[PDB]
Swiss-Prot record:
Binding site for Mg(2+) 2: 21, 56, 76, 127
Residue numbers of the full-length protein present here: 1014 to 1147 of 1435
Site (Cleavage): 18-19
Name the record gives this protein: p15
Impact upon substituting residue 56 to Q: Complete loss of RNase H activity
Lineage, opening ranks: Viruses, Riboviria, Pararnavirae, Artverviricota, Revtraviricetes
Boundaries of every RNase H type-1 domain copy: 12-135
């Protein structure tokens, strides 16, 4: 049970695989954020005052919404990496707070991110055709 859920954030013994990634202009803290679960689900949301990593944090809540018990939350965010991993049930960022509460009523989500911007679940060397849109990730 740990603090408020099963501290995973790393390779899980055997949990469902989920994706999480959103693009929202950091400089303005706004844009889109969605996810795709192994059940073939796809959602999207707008960011408000949320940092680049928080854009993925909000989206993180998505993969955590239909996650279930134990899933693999693949999200590009070194911030969540720091907070979302540190049981942010009530620490630092406010987003991770909501994300954890949901993580509480479940098992565990493997949250990972490696220096880049195109390393998530299903991308296929393409995000959403960036045409100078105002949804760049810092």
């Amino acid at each position: 049970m740990n603090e408020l859920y099963q501290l995973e954030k790393e390779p899980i013994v055997g949990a469902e695989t989920f994706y999480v990634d959103g693009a929202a202009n950091r400089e303005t803290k706004l844009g889109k954020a969605g996810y795709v679960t192994n059940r073939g689900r796809q959602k999207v949301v707008t960011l408000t005052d949320t940092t680049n990593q928080k854009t993925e944090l909000q989206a993180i809540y998505l993969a955590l919404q239909d996650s279930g018990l134990e899933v693999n939350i693949v999200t590009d965010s070194q911030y969540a990496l720091g907070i979302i991993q540190a049981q942010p049930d009530q620490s630092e960022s406010e987003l991770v707070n909501q994300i954890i509460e949901q993580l509480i009523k479940k098992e565990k989500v493997y949250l990972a991110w490696v220096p880049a911007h195109k390393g998530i679940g299903g991308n296929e060397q393409v995000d959403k055709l960036v045409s100078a849109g105002i949804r760049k990730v810092l």
